[PDB]
């Protein structure tokens, strides 16, 4: 396939960029980000246009393009 570059913005305004294929499940991006922050993956929620990114979402499914932004927040009360 071919790759797009996504920018992941943290609560402290820091950024890590990820190159990902249009068909790759975004679980792998979440794991890498959490690993690099040194926190459990389940302590974080990952949002695209404010909507929750699921483990089996792909960039194609979400309509993501080159240089789109993902925001990371702490997980919230409830489901």
């Amino acid at each position: 396939g071919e790759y797009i570059k996504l920018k992941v913005i943290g609560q402290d305004s820091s950024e890590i960029h990820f190159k990902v294929k249009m068909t790759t499940h975004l679980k792998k991006l979440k794991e890498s980000y959490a690993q690099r922050q040194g926190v459990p993956m389940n302590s974080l929620r990952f949002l695209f246009e404010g909507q929750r990114i699921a483990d089996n979402h792909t960039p194609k499914e979400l309509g993501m393009e080159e240089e789109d932004v993902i925001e990371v927040y702490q997980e919230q009360t409830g489901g």
């Binding site: 960029h17 990820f18 190159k19 792998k28 991006l29």
Partner: peptide, 12 residues
């Protein structure tokens, strides 16, 4: 100021 960080994610 932080340097640029780009990580390549592989498929399955």
């Amino acid at each position: 100021e932080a340097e640029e960080r780009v990580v390549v994610i592989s498929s399955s």
